[PDB]
Amino acid sequence: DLRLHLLLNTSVTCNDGSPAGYYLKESRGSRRWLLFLEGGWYCFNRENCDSRYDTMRRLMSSRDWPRTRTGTGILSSQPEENPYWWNANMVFIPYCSSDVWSGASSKSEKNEYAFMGALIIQEVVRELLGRGLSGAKVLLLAGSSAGGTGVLLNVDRVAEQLEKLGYPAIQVRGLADSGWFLDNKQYRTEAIRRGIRYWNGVVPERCRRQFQEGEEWNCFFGYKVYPTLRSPVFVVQWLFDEAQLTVDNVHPVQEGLRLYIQNLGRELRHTLKDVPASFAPACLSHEIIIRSHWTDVQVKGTSLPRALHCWDRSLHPLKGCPVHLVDSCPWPHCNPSCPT
Ligand SMILES: *[C@@H]1O[C@H](CO)[C@@H](O)[C@H](O)[C@H]1NC(C)=O
């Protein structure tokens, strides 16, 4: 069980002005810290956010959060469930800002909602330094879905924050799960561009300087933001991610749809060619790395917990310990280990 702590700086808030927070389980024999960003889409205008407040309120407010949560998958403390980092200090950061972790805008007379995702991450890091993070050797910022994109948007800012605060020995790394999307044509980006204006959203500085004003939405797409990042980042992405297919309007397959799906997998595989640490199975799935059976999938005979361990070793090619694992087969479930 991870225990809830509401932020001591109560001006760093969820959408409705209630305090943001984090769930923590300490492991005093470990200098490894895992900070995980929850996902859950986003909202981009007043009417769309009002609808989310009616039926997805835990994603907009801390008022109903439970006192504890169980760590599962990569957040589990049991070696059988988590062969990678079972002994680490574990942190789960709830997603209550609806801004893909990019916002830095408070509620005010002109703003019905606060969008503070980028500031929530910074404040969690600051408050953890007094609970043991000051002694860390590695801080892994991980996340799933919208939280995976959040990793790409925030990992370099966390590294800079710790350097400026005076902690140069902490190695900051990222793990982005299910947050690597393509701005492709549908089978049958406007919302993100509108969202960024609504949230006062911020993107990493080098990417911002490449794309310039009005074009910062480009930095929400992994293949465009990844090459600009300085921190090491491991990318996990299904070749046929269900959220990608939903936005593409894909739900006895005829030739046009067969070609569309095959081209999507080939494009995803191409964007990962120059990503040295990656795990990309040929599956149609919405499943994420905090599920209890995350150990089950393999690419070329290697599981994700093994690949992450090999990544740790590489940051000290390795014989029999690979880190770049991308399926080449062209149709969903051509990998026999895909989630069922
Ligand atoms: C609380 O957070 C806000 C927003 O990041 C910041 O402006 C303020 O300085 C913080 N307060 C303290 C005491 O650190």
Ligand SMILES: O=C(O)COCc1ccccc1
């Ligand atoms: O969570 C989702 O599946 C989609 O929303 C987040 C997003 C991330 C990147 C680009 C656009 C949107």
